[PDB]
Amino acid sequence: PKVPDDIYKTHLENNRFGGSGSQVDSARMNLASSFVNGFVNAAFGQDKLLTDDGNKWLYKNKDHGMLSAAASLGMILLWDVDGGLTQIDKYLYSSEDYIKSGALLACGIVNSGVRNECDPALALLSDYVLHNSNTMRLGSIFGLGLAYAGSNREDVLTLLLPVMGDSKSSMEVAGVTALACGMIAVGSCNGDVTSTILQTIMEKSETELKDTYARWLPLGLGLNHLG
Amino acid sequence: TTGIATIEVFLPPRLKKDRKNLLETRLHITGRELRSKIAETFGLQENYIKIVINKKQLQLGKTLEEQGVAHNVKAMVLELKQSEEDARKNFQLEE
Numbered sequence: 001p002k003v004p005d006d007i008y009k010t011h012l013e014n015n016r017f018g019g020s021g022s023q024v025d026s027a028r029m030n031l032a033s034s035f036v037n038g039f040v041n042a043a044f045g046q047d048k049l050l051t052d053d054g055n056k057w058l059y060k061n062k063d064h065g066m067l068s069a070a071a072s073l074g075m076i077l078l079w080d081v082d083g084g085l086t087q088i089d090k091y092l093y094s095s096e097d098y099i100k101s102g103a104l105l106a107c108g109i110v111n112s113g114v115r116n117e118c119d120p121a122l123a124l125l126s127d128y129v130l131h132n133s134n135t136m137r138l139g140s141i142f143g144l145g146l147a148y149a150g151s152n153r154e155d156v157l158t159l160l161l162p163v164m165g166d167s168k169s170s171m172e173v174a175g176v177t178a179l180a181c182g183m184i185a186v187g188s189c190n191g192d193v194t195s196t197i198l199q200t201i202m203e204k205s206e207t208e209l210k211d212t213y214a215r216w217l218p219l220g221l222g223l224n225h226l227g
Numbered sequence: 228t229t230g231i232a233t234i235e236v237f238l239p240p241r242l243k244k245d246r247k248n249l250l251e252t253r254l255h256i257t258g259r260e261l262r263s264k265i266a267e268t269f270g271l272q273e274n275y276i277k278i279v280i281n282k283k284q285l286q287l288g289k290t291l292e293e294q295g296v297a298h299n300v301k302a303m304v305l306e307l308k309q310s311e312e313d314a315r316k317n318f319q320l321e322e
Contacts, residue, residue, distance in 0.1 A: 082239030086306040089277070093314045095322035117247070118237055118301030123279030155282065 001047045004036040027065040030057075034065075038072035045077040051087055058091070058099060067135065070094075070102020071142075074110040084110030085120065101139025104128075108143025121147040122156065129163055134170040137163075141173075145180040152185050157193055160184075164196050171208070175216035182223025189225050197221050230254040232296045234261075234280065238269055238304045254292045258285040261296065265304070274313070277305030287311070 010022070034057070041047045049057070050073060058069045073091055077084040085107060092103040104124070111121055125140035141163070144156060163169065163177045178197065185193050201217050208214070236248050252264055262273035262285065278285045280302050281295035309317055 080240075082237075082304070082306070083241060085303075086239065086241075086308065089305065090308045090314065090318070093309070093318045095318055116237060116303070118279060118303050119282065120279050120303045120305065122282045123284050123303075126283055 001041045001044065001049075003049065004033045004040070007036055007040050025060060027062050030061050031065045031068050034061075034069040034072045038075040041076055043078040045080040045083060047076045050076045054091060055094065058094075058102070059096075063098070066096070066099060067102040067105070067139065070099050071105030071109060071139075073102065074106025074108075077110050078112060079110075079114050081111050081114050081116055081120075097133075098135055101135040101137075104136070104139035104143035105146070106143075108146035108148075111143075111147030112149060115148075115151070119148070119153075122153075126159070129159055130166070132168070134173045137169070138173055138176045141176050141180045145183045149183055150186050152188060152190075156184050157181060157190065161192075161196055164200055171211065171213045175213055175219075178216050178220035179223070182220035182226075185224045187223075187227040193224050194221075197224065228298070230292070231298075232291060232300060233298050234296060234300045234302050236265060236269065236278070236302045236304055238271065239306050241306070242269075242271060242304075244269060252291070252296075254296060255290060257290045258287040258294055261285065261291060262287075269304075271304060271306070274310040275307050277307055277311065278302045279305070 037047065037050055041050070054073050058066050058073070061069050070091055074084055074088045077087065088103055088106050088110065091099060092107065094100060094103060107124070108121060121144050125144050128140040129137060131137045131140070148156060160177060160181050164181070169177070181193050181197070197217065197220055201221070204214070204217070230253060232252050232254055234250050234252065236250055237246060238244050238248060248269055250265060250268055252261065262276060262278060265271060265276065265278065266273040281297055281300050283295045286294040307314055
């Protein structure tokens with residue numbers, strides 16, 4: 001495995017501030033380092049800093065940053081379904097309930113590109129798609145999307161329909177749900193999903209439409225009607 | 228048929244065994260008995276494996292009939308670094 005420190009080649013860079021300018025671990029640079037020690041070491045199913053020191057590193061992030069770190073947790077191991085799930089269940093049972101969304105994201109990314117006949121992701125998310133807190137439901141939906149990318153399984157769309165009708169879900173959750181429903185039926189023009197998104201967008205209000213997070217609904221419409 | 232389930236289980240690649248295995252069991256038993264029989268038939272820890280049945284997770288306190296187990300139903304073999312109850316308790320202690 002490659003180390004993010006090696007990838008950045010900090011030895012070669014002109015360290016004008018030596019030993020004092022790199023001791024600050026902000027949330028943003030932590031997220032960047034997680035994304036690096038993810039993508040870089042991704043698909044090898046191994047890492048010398050993420051599989052063993054995942055939780056301590058994760059705790060240093062806040063809200064979104066910790067979510068992304070948890071997702072990268074499994075992002076390390078792509079295409080290894082059983083091993084990835086075994087290595088990610090411990091964080092799925094993390095102390096902070098907010099880590100669970102990132103754990104679901106990591107589980108979906110591990111399963112991303114690989115389909116198992118018994119489909120663990122749907123079973124995991126069946127009792128969590130209605131979960132009241134937005135972030136954990138978002139993590140479950142994204143895990144489903146990555147693991148089940150392009151599945152077009154009618155069960156997932158039917159379950160998401162209550163998600164579409166769940167006004168309790170937040171705007172970010174709504175955008176994630178639209179993206180997931182589009183990814184399920186990428187390039188298919190799903191009639192049921194088509195009608196659902198149509199009704200959602202007409203039912204949408206201008207006051208709650210002016211927001212910057214309302215730009216994903218056409219994303220889902222196109223994804224369903226892509227190509 | 229007589230309330231029995233021919234559930235097919237998916238063992239992890241770590242255990243060098245058949246990926247798809249057919250398991251014969253009754254329906255009046257609970258998830259704990261399901262995992263115990265999985266251990267007896269395929270040699271894997273009962274409490275260290277998580278099984279998803281019929282697009283749903285295992286219910287240790289619920290019987291097979293009410294937990295979704297059916298004929299030829301699929302099921303993961305989710306090896307857990309910690310037992311579900313043990314994992315819960317230990318990671319709640321580690322907070």
